[PDB]
């Protein structure tokens, strides 16, 4: 998955 933290 992308990861819930990847955009930070």
């Amino acid at each position, epitope marked *: *998955a*992308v*990861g*819930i933290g*990847a955009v*930070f």
Partner: antibody
Amino acid sequence: QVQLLQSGAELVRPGASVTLSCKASGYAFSDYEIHWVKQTPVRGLDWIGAFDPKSGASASNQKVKGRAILTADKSSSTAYMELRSLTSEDSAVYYCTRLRYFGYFDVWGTGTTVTVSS
Amino acid sequence: DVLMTQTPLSLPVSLGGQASISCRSSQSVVYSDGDTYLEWYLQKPGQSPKLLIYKVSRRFSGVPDRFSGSGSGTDFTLKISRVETEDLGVYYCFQGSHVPYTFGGGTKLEIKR
């Protein structure tokens, strides 16, 4: 030797809470999110939510919102999920699993069998 | 929220044959970075789930060539060729593109011998 250790079983009363723990070893704890997956025979696999130790972010699914609290203790490499106001619908096997950004669920815990019963 | 609908619920296949499992997302699961984070997991009796396919068609390390994933956008398909006895279990698709992530409902492979 990456591994994720969970307690084997928790018996909990209806209306009480349970605390699930996921103790990681064999890797750098902050480099991986911990995700929580509920398994039952008929409803299958159910992504419950996640905690990212690097950014500190958390998320959870719509159904469990308001009842689930996801945290992590970096010093002891342990992620936690607390679930409150349990009913028999919450009885299930709960797995933890790890996720690097843009990666996949490559390593899993062996699962905690939660039984909600008096 | 993004709904993953997997068919069929149970799949008989003769040993040495080929099984086809399909999974359809309710919305697109292409991520802004261009990739589609669609994964296939297998749960064998008495074990934890295990990763088979990530990124619609790429094979996790150790996963034989007989497993091949494909699809696009809305419609995805996992193909098991030359089925062996060890392939028994419940196969699940999974989208990891849009929070909240979601699993398909599962397909239980049934081996005919």
